Amino acid sequence: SHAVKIYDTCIGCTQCVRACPLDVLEMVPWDGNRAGSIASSPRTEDCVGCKRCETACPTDFLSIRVYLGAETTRSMGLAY
Amino acid sequence: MLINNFEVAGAFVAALIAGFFALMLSTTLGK
Amino acid sequence: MNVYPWLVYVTTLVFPLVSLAALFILIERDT
Amino acid sequence: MNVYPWLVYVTTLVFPLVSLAALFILIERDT
Amino acid sequence: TRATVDNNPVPTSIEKWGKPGWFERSLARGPKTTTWIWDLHALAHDFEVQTSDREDIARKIFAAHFGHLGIVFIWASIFFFYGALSSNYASWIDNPTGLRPSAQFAIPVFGQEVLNDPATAAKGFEQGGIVMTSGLFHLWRAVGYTNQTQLLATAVGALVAAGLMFFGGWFHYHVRAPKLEWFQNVESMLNHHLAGLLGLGSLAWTGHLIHVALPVNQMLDKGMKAADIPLPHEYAFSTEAMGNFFPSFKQGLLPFFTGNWAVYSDFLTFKGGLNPQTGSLWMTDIAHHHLAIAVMFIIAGHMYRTNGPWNPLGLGHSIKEILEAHKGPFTGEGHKGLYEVLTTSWHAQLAINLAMVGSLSIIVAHHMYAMNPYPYMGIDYPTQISLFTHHMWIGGFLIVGAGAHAAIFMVRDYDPAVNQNNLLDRVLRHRDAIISHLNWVCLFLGFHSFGLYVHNDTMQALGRPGDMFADWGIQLQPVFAQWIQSVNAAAFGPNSTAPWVSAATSPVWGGNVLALPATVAGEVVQKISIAPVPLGTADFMIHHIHALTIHVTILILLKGVLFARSSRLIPDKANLGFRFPCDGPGRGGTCQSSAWDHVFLGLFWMYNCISIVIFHFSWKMQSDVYGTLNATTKAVEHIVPSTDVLLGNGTTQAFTQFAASSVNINGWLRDFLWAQAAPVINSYGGPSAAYGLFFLGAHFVWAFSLMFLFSGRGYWQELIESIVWAHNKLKIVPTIQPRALSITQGRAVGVAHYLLGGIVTTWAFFIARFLAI
Amino acid sequence: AAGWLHLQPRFRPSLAWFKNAESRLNHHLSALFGVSSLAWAGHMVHVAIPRAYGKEVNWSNFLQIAPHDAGLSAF
Amino acid sequence: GMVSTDDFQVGTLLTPVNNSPFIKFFINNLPINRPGLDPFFRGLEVGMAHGYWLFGPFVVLGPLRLTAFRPPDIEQLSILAALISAIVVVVAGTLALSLYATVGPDDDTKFGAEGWSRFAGGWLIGGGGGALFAALLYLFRGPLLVMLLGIIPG
Amino acid sequence: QANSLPPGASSPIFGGSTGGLLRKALVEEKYLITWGSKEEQVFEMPTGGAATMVAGVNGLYLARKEQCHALHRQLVAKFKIRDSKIYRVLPNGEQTLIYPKDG
Numbered sequence A: 001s002h003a004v005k006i007y008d009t010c011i012g013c014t015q016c017v018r019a020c021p022l023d024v025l026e027m028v029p030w031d032g033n034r035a036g037s038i039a040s041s042p043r044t045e046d047c048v049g050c051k052r053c054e055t056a057c058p059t060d061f062l063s064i065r066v067y068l069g070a071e072t073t074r075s076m077g078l079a080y
Numbered sequence B: 001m002l003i004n005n006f007e008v009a010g011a012f013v014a015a016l017i018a019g020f021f022a023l024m025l026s027t028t029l030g031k
Numbered sequence C, D: 001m002n003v004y005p006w007l008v009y010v011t012t013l014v015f016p017l018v019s020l021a022a023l024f025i026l027i028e029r030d031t
Numbered sequence E: 001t002r003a004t005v006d007n008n009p010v011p012t013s014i015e016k017w018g019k020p021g022w023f024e025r026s027l028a029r030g031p032k033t034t035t036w037i038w039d040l041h042a043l044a045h046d047f048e049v050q051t052s053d054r055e056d057i058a059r060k061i062f063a064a065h066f067g068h069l070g071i072v073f074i075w076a077s078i079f080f081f082y083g084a085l086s087s088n089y090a091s092w093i094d095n096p097t098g099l100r101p102s103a104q105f106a107i108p109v110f111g112q113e114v115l116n117d118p119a120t121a122a123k124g125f126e127q128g129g130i131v132m133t134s135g136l137f138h139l140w141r142a143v144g145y146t147n148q149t150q151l152l153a154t155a156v157g158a159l160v161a162a163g164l165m166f167f168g169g170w171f172h173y174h175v176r177a178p179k180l181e182w183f184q185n186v187e188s189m190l191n192h193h194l195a196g197l198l199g200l201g202s203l204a205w206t207g208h209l210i211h212v213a214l215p216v217n218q219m220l221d222k223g224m225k226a227a228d229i230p231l232p233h234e235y236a237f238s239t240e241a242m243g244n245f246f247p248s249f250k251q252g253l254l255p256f257f258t259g260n261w262a263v264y265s266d267f268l269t270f271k272g273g274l275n276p277q278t279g280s281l282w283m284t285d286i287a288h289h290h291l292a293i294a295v296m297f298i299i300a301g302h303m304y305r306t307n308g309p310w311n312p313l314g315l316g317h318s319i320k321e322i323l324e325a326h327k328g329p330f331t332g333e334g335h336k337g338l339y340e341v342l343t344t345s346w347h348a349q350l351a352i353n354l355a356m357v358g359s360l361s362i363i364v365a366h367h368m369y370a371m372n373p374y375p376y377m378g379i380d381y382p383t384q385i386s387l388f389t390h391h392m393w394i395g396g397f398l399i400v401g402a403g404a405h406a407a408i409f410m411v412r413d414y415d416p417a418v419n420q421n422n423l424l425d426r427v428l429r430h431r432d433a434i435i436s437h438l439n440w441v442c443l444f445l446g447f448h449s450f451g452l453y454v455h456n457d458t459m460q461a462l463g464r465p466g467d468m469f470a471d472w473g474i475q476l477q478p479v480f481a482q483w484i485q486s487v488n489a490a491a492f493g494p495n496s497t498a499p500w501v502s503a504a505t506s507p508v509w510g511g512n513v514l515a516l517p518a519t520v521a522g523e524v525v526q527k528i529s530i531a532p533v534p535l536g537t538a539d540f541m542i543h544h545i546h547a548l549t550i551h552v553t554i555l556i557l558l559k560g561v562l563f564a565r566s567s568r569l570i571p572d573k574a575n576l577g578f579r580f581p582c583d584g585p586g587r588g589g590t591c592q593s594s595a596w597d598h599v600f601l602g603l604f605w606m607y608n609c610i611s612i613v614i615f616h617f618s619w620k621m622q623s624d625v626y627g628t629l630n631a632t633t634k635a636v637e638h639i640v641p642s643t644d645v646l647l648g649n650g651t652t653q654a655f656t657q658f659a660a661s662s663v664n665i666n667g668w669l670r671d672f673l674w675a676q677a678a679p680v681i682n683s684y685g686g687p688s689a690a691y692g693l694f695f696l697g698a699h700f701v702w703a704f705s706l707m708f709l710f711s712g713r714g715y716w717q718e719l720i721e722s723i724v725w726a727h728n729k730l731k732i733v734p735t736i737q738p739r740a741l742s743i744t745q746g747r748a749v750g751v752a753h754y755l756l757g758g759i760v761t762t763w764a765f766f767i768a769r770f771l772a773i
Numbered sequence F: 001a002a003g004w005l006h007l008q009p010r011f012r013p014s015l016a017w018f019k020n021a022e023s024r025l026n027h028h029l030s031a032l033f034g035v036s037s038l039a040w041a042g043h044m045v046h047v048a049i050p051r052a053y054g055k056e057v058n059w060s061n062f063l064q065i066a067p068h069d070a071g072l073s074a075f
Numbered sequence G: 001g002m003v004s005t006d007d008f009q010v011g012t013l014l015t016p017v018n019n020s021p022f023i024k025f026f027i028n029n030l031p032i033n034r035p036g037l038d039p040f041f042r043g044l045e046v047g048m049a050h051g052y053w054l055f056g057p058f059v060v061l062g063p064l065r066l067t068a069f070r071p072p073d074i075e076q077l078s079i080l081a082a083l084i085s086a087i088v089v090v091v092a093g094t095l096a097l098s099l100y101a102t103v104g105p106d107d108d109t110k111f112g113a114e115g116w117s118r119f120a121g122g123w124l125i126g127g128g129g130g131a132l133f134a135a136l137l138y139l140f141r142g143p144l145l146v147m148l149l150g151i152i153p154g
Numbered sequence H: 001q002a003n004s005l006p007p008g009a010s011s012p013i014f015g016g017s018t019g020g021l022l023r024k025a026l027v028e029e030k031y032l033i034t035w036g037s038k039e040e041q042v043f044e045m046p047t048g049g050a051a052t053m054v055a056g057v058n059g060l061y062l063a064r065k066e067q068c069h070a071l072h073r074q075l076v077a078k079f080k081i082r083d084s085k086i087y088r089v090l091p092n093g094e095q096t097l098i099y100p101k102d103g
């Protein structure tokens, strides 16, 4: 599966969970921003690698990085 | 003058249409 | 002459034995 | 003309298809 | 009905001219990067992302139509000015066969005057000139132009008509603009585009042919010169002048009102094919043509029901009841919804209309070489290659746009509530079967046409000419097409299926080689305008190439249409739009998954289709039709000679060059593409030297495309990072940010330059070959 | 194709259409026994009688050549 | 009416190409689907049909075919070459079927790997036999397509 | 038969398409979206075509989880339905909740 990393530059804008086609991400409580929440990925086995979360992250460099790795049925987007 | 093989081929195209319609009516009559 | 002898072999010899084997399958297999 | 034609038939035609079948066995059977 | 029109929506100002990008919200914030510049141009005619109100959208489309008809009248005026000031038309009317037609010269500056052909030099036009290939002069001779001042009057009238279309656009947008209820009464607009636009158009054209074009062409064919009468053989006061040309019935329009129609059988005939004297259609058959289809178009505009204050009028059909009457058990609920589709979506109408007009331009390309419409036109061979090639290319482009706006409908204007169990819905329910079966028949056509060509390359290379799919080897005879040639050739005489025809449909069906008088320096008659066009094994093969290329272009564009909204890969593709680059490198990679990309791929596959079509036409017309009658014993000598095919036993057999050499790719390379490109590469220092320059420049533009086609923008953006560093080191800082081109726009630049380079290379090759011989 | 069509439940007729039996007699004496007999009379006057006397009438020239030179004014 | 689906989640349509009862009788009693048959016999009958028709394109269309060659001296070479061609195409099909078998098949047949190897074996024997049978009847088409008794004397 | 709904859910009216389930649903995994609707109304299938759904609880088996989540965002963005639940259905009949995971 692909590798989803959340760094410490997150602002809690709620844009990487709204624009993700597969619900890989969710918000957990955190102390280091103003929204009080950081993104997390406990469902990386369903991620396809489509990088719509990387399109919608409003920082300088993206706080989310998905790394393209081992390919499964779910990650190659196969309905067969 | 007798008929040649292309006119037999046209008659067999016509008989293929007839055989398809025969097959359809015999199978629907089987229901 | 104007004959297709292979067609006589198909439709008078092969195809009736074919047809009797198909009707044997139709009248002897249960469901 | 000094030719071994059967050897051309072996290693240009038979042996490559042999080799792709063996490599197919190498890449498609688990353990 | 009732023409419900609002008054003054838009004030006429200059305030939006100083603000580019006002029409879209992201463009209105100002240029920050350079992609705004390309986003300024790509969204200029997308009125649906500018305003959300469909009524205002329809008014923008309507004023755009008037402005386009204005620009087409400007172009029409531009060639009418060039035919009216700097042409050889005063001397081309006396020698249509020995003088090359020209309406443009190159002025005495930089050495370009070697471009002036001295076979266009005659009286008035004593400079030489650029030989044209549009066939405007033969059109003009057929409709009755004998003089350059009336060409000037047409030019002034076309500028006045351009001004009228611009004032109509400004009036019907800015002052008094129609509403959405006016556009959706499609019944009345069909009734007044059949009976009024096409019906009265060809009825008034029949009026032009009868009063002007048949007598002037009879004077040009009976042997008198350009000193003609244009005003005293007309109207009531010289009614007997209609009797001096070809006997105007008994007296006047009195046998029109009394019903005896047989006394007009001298200028409305049904004779048949082409005239032997001029190589073209009989003008009386043309007039009786446009009258019979004029009549049947006024009958065609009497079909659909329109209700109003007209009392007994209002009988007919509503289109919705016809569509909702055709249901079927295979097709569910049939055409219900398609009236609401075609009365609320502009893109669906544009898809149908681009399909029909592109198909019709291809139909036009076939029938105008097939029946020559205009006098001495079929012997001017650059015009024949150029109009076939032109109308083929315009036809293929409009078919690709048809697939485009069908997919744009499927992205934008598809409503699932309207399209419940109709044909449009159930096509989307079995789109996998359609695209997969289409994929299979494209594979079948490609193997069983191109692998035949590859087989012929192989067996001719291996020294096995009898093993070839050819007329001397494994014969693939087009027996259905040859049988239809025999039927359309045989259907003219007594005891046939069209008993009162003198000279058949066309001579291409298998009857007679037709030739015309022309000079060519100091020679004899020669000049086959038209001949029977025989079909053999090579025609089987090239037509299955054509079926292949048509079917792959269908497969690409139709896979764009049916998978526009969703797929098994991307189920939310309609939310991503018509025009997006990808949905990321995931799911293996989703590059070129948008329906726009299928328009992008279908553009090159249209290039393939139409290029092999015009290549077939060039070699075919050249090898079996076009050429010379020999001065001894009237023998046919074609433009390329016959080939003595070496058989496997040792002897030869005579075939023509298409029949011998167009069965493999080596003969296409050598005898078509190496041999006939000799006059485009040897053209320097002479009148065709520009066509050599366009040939080389179009090779450049075609190769220049492949930088944009084979690369992508992340390379270019980090390269522009290094160039932007070089600019910021020397205090040269643009506020508009230098960006790499976007992915979709880089694909668009690449397809634009690929298309421009290939078609202009092929244009240069065709015109520079066909001017020579 | 008509038999296969009339087995489909849109085109299957009702029992009342079968047991109508006046209209069946009217149509068989009118069309099946009379129009076919009149059509065969038309075949004999258009084809068989002129071809017995050496003059050939086929499916390309039947609209032009009459059975009789006093044609249809005598009717 | 004609097109139903009978499990509308499954991406298929039940159509008179699909669901006409004689088409189901034909497809369901082709030898790969005909009930009560060991996989070897299914392969045998598939091979016999295939290997019988596979002789034809090689003999009519192959490198040894024409009327401008050396008598019917080359005709025996044509029949033998087409025979060997159809048997080696059947051998390639056998190789294909048994490479399918030996790597472990997952399919709607209830064949095993062993069952697909029985199919591969029956395919090979039936295919080469169908080639040999089509070659013998092609050798016999002279007397087969005429009344042979009548030209021969006595 | 093979695609049996959980009890309480009813099938939406659909004519059947070719974009739907393949062999993988039989042998590896399939997915099931189940939502609530207040009327009988018309939506677009993620596998092509148009369907309508009755009032009450509706369920649909799809080949991929992205197809179900695309159907979920279509229900949110077009008909304001936010009680869609997505199950991963194994071939032995085991269903596990994967959306919403937080409840």
Ligand code: CLA
Binding pocket: E041, E042, E043, E044, E045, E046, E047, E354, E397, E398, E399, E400, E401, E402, E404, E408, E578, E579, E596, E599, E600, E603, E752, E756
């Ligand atoms: C009746 C004809 C017609 C009409 C009204 C439209 C209208 C439209 N099309 Mg369209 N289309 C058509 C035919 C038509 N098309 C054909 C024939 C094709 C096949 C080529 C296409 C393929 C197509 C695509 C792929 C797309 C459209 C899109 C659009 C929309 C916006 C386009 C725009 O903003 O302008 C902008 C125009 C430009 C930026 C010009 C581009 C550069 C041109 C092509 C180069 C010109 C070269 C020139 C011909 C020769 C060389 C000269 C040079 C050396 C100087 C608009 C609704 C776009 C859309 O988003 O739909 C909603 C889009 O995605 N069309």
Ligand code: CLA
Binding pocket: E438, E439, E440, E442, E443, E444, E445, E446, E447, E450, E451, E454, E548, E552, E555, E556, E601, E604, E605
């Ligand atoms: C010359 C280069 C080339 C070739 C050979 C192809 C070939 C093909 N294209 Mg492609 N294409 C090309 C350029 C080319 N394309 C370019 C530049 C683009 C960019 C715009 C595309 C974009 C494109 C799209 C978008 C599509 C295709 C499709 C296809 C397939 C069409 C089916 C067919 O023709 O039947 C048969 C195959 C051929 C004619 C190829 C040659 C086969 C030879 C003659 C047989 C060889 C014999 C044997 C196998 C060799 C064995 C030797 C052994 C040692 C291995 C075909 C395989 C379409 C498709 O997939 O439909 C089915 C499809 O949709 N093409």
Ligand SMILES: CC1=C(/C=C/C(C)=C/C=C/C(C)=C/C=C/C=C(C)/C=C/C=C(C)/C=C/C2=C(C)CCCC2(C)C)C(C)(C)CCC1
Binding pocket: G048, G049, G050, G052, G053, G125, G126, G128, G129, G130, G132, G133
């Ligand atoms: C579907 C169908 C169709 C088609 C069909 C076909 C396609 C055909 C065919 C055919 C064929 C294709 C046939 C075949 C055959 C065969 C055979 C009959 C064989 C054989 C053989 C043998 C007998 C062999 C033997 C052997 C062996 C095994 C071992 C050793 C050697 C030998 C030689 C002894 C149609 C539409 C028409 C109709 C309906 C149905």
Ligand SMILES: CC1=C(/C=C/C(C)=C\C=C\C(C)=C\C=C\C=C(C)/C=C/C=C(C)/C=C/C2=C(C)CCCC2(C)C)C(C)(C)CCC1
Binding pocket: E694, E696, E697, E698, E700, E701, E756, E757, E759, E760, E763
């Ligand atoms: C340095 C410089 C320069 C130079 C440049 C160069 C070096 C170039 C080039 C270029 C090339 C190397 C090329 C090319 C080409 C072109 C082309 C290719 C074109 C075009 C176009 C057009 C306009 C088209 C037209 C047409 C059409 C429309 C279609 C049909 C055909 C024709 C042709 C008619 C210059 C002078 C600017 C100036 C200064 C600076």
Ligand SMILES: CC(C)=CCC/C(C)=C\CC/C(C)=C\CC/C(C)=C/CC1=C(C)C(=O)c2ccccc2C1=O
Binding pocket: E707, E708, E709, E711, E712, E713, E716, E739, E740, E741, E742, E743, E745, E746, E747
């Ligand atoms: C009056 C007049 C004409 C003014 C001209 C206006 C003035 C002054 C400058 C305008 C700059 C110009 C003329 C071009 C810039 C285009 C550009 C940055 C290309 C780099 C690039 C290449 C080469 C690719 O292959 C490619 C492939 C796929 C995706 C992206 C790319 C890509 O980005």
Ligand code: SF4
Binding pocket: A009, A010, A011, A012, A013, A014, A015, A016, A017, A038, A039, A053, A056, A057, A058, A059, A062, A063, A064
């Ligand atoms: S990772 Fe990016 S998109 Fe997600 S919450 Fe943080 S800043 Fe927003």
Ligand code: SF4
Binding pocket: E581, E582, E583, E584, E585, E586, E589, E590, E591, E592, E712, E743
């Ligand atoms: S390479 Fe370009 S088009 Fe392909 S997935 Fe990546 S960004 Fe998208």
